[PDB]
């Protein structure tokens with residue numbers, strides 16, 4: 001089945017992974033250096049054995065593809081995937097007054113979880129309808145939108161890294177320099193989250209576009225399914241714009257890990273039986289992906305087992 | 314045998330690789346996305362089935378480790394691996410007078426090869442003994458020494474990327490952010506050679522340092538053996554400085570390819586039988602690798618079959 005390599009990865013870290021301390025003081029079981037392939041000709045790698053909301057994937061990737069870094073666009077699609085990072089600079093700012101919000105994400109795991117959900121609703125509506133607030137606390141800064149489409153240069157300017165590589169694929173498809181990078185040595189030592197999706201690379205041979213992601217670290221239970229779909233989607237999108245058929249998505253990992261408190265959740269999922277893979281439908285009559293909207297992308301026959309509970313990693 | 318994964322890679326591209334046009338107008342047989350592992354506890358991955366001069370590896374890696382970008386240091390060790398790039402800016406410069414040196418590297422493949430070797434001897438001695446010349450034509454600029462140790466920042470400064478990551482490994486060994494990057498989006502669109510060794514990543518779990526290289530494109534016959542040894546050496550060196558034992562070197566590839574005119578050479582080599590792996594000896598009494606000299610690194614029991622002829626890729 002198309003998602004088997006995901007299920008083998010979970011199972012490999014289960015059986016032969018070693019205990020590794022981590023930055024968050026959860027325990028992990030970890031392996032270093034791993035590689036999965038997904039043949040995109042065969043269908044779309046949205047796990048069927050655990051629900052992954054494709055609406056969430058596509059709205060975030062479109063956020064990225066527009067060069068957007070403000071939570072507002074996500075919110076207008078009720079995509080709450082980055083909310084907690086924006087909240088960070090609201091709570092801790094010289095403009096915040098309210099109840100205690102230190103360790104917010106950490107201590108929300110049982111009575112605090114009630115007032116927290118309260119301030120987060122006040123923060124979301126405010127970002128939605130208060131432009132100056134949005135500008136100050138809604139904008140994430142150095143997230144994948146700027147890195148891909150507005151990369152800051154030593155000379156004061158800004159480089160459209162992904163735009164330029166697409167023209168390269170169009171014009172020199174056989175080039176082995178088709179790299180988009182999210183890793184800025186000037187920025188990583190002090191940034192909130194150095195990008196886990198460090199670098200990707202396009203490849204064209206005989207009508208097919210492929211992509212390989214180098215992911216420096218991977219939460220197997222929560223992150224990976226979402227990460228497979230984002231970058232498999234991007235492969236399709238870029239193929240679509242270049243008039244190419246779709247090849248493989250290759251997921252390469254640095255530290256691929258299972259958090260200690262996701263062990264039961266993973267055992268639950270491994271006893272589930274993969275269902276026929278959904279198929280991706282892209283707008284046949286629109287090709288300029290930076291101008292893509294939600295309706296331009298549709299998934300057919302997605303048939304997941306339910307979502308599985310977590311504690312957040 | 315320790316080098317089997319190299320021999321399987323050659324054999325995989327032989328049997329299931331597809332013909333791909335390239336930048337140099339040679340033909341290639343190519344595959345996209347590949348991953349080899351070398352257990353460094355088992356011995357040193359210097360191919361025995363084809364001679365790889367370790368002297369050349371170590372002098373180049375020391376060049377890098379010092380932040381050096383001038384051909385002069387290489388030359389003092391009779392390391393001619395980068396000469397042709399420096400020559401480039403001499404021949405084509407507003408200071409060159411002599412016989413025709415256009416396409417120099419390309420047309421040197423039968424009577425031209427005599428006068429070319431002549432100007433290259435005049436260029437090498439000149440760089441060796443003429444400091445101002447050395448400064449103008451000996452210095453390569455944006456090669457791995459600056460990228461690793463003097464990375465230029467938007468604010469006019471220069472970042473010691475590799476120095477800083479070593480302190481990180483020392484101080485936060487379990488960090489999943491131990492990345493050194495050679496890929497600068499500001500520089501790649503106009504540079505002579507965008508680095509093939511795009512990015513590497515360190516990993517520590519239970520006393521062992523590992524490293525993974527993301528190599529964007531790989532000449533299997535000429536480049537790869539040299540590339541395995543460079544980065545396996547760096548793994549040992551960094552382990553040595555951090556007081557760690559050695560784990561795995563993981564070589565990950567974008568476009569791993571066999572040039573069309575290296576097919577016989579590769580078939581010759583596959584009929585050779587791997588010999589017991591050499592063992593690496595590092596100075597037990599010196600640990601600061603940026604202060605390492607040639608004598609600080611020794612290889613024991615290296616026992617290669619002869620070198621194999623080529624046309625240069």
Ligand SMILES: Cc1cccc2c1C(=O)N(c1cc(-c3ccccc3)ccc1O)C2=O
Nearest residue numbers: 080081082083085193222223224226227310
């Ligand atoms: C990089 C970055 C930055 C901020 C915030 C998130 C991420 C991120 O990667 N994710 C994420 C969430 C889920 C998830 C899983 C179950 C339920 C809800 C969300 C799954 C995969 C993910 O990668 C973030 O929420």
Ligand SMILES: Cc1cccc2c1C(=O)N(c1cc(-c3ccccc3)ccc1O)C2=O
Nearest residue numbers: 393394395396398506535536537539540623
């Ligand atoms: C990146 C870069 C830049 C300039 C110049 C060289 C390289 C390079 O990688 N090499 C190289 C040479 C040989 C080689 C093979 C047989 C004989 C002599 C040399 C093997 C592997 C190599 O990677 C360069 O010469």
Ligand SMILES: O=c1ccn([C@H]2C[C@H](O)[C@@H](COP(=O)(O)O)O2)c(=O)[nH]1
Nearest residue numbers: 023196217218219223224227313489
């Ligand atoms: O898109 C993402 C973003 C984050 N992570 C996970 C990996 C790590 O568990 C954690 C990041 O922590 P560090 O690697 O930066 O330490 O989040 C993912 O898996 N995918």
Ligand SMILES: O=c1ccn([C@H]2C[C@H](O)[C@@H](COP(=O)(O)O)O2)c(=O)[nH]1
Nearest residue numbers: 176336509530531532536537540626
């Ligand atoms: O250290 C190196 C440097 C270069 N190459 C090879 C790969 C390609 O065949 C060629 C570089 O050409 P491009 O990938 O930039 O097109 O040199 C290597 O294998 N290893």
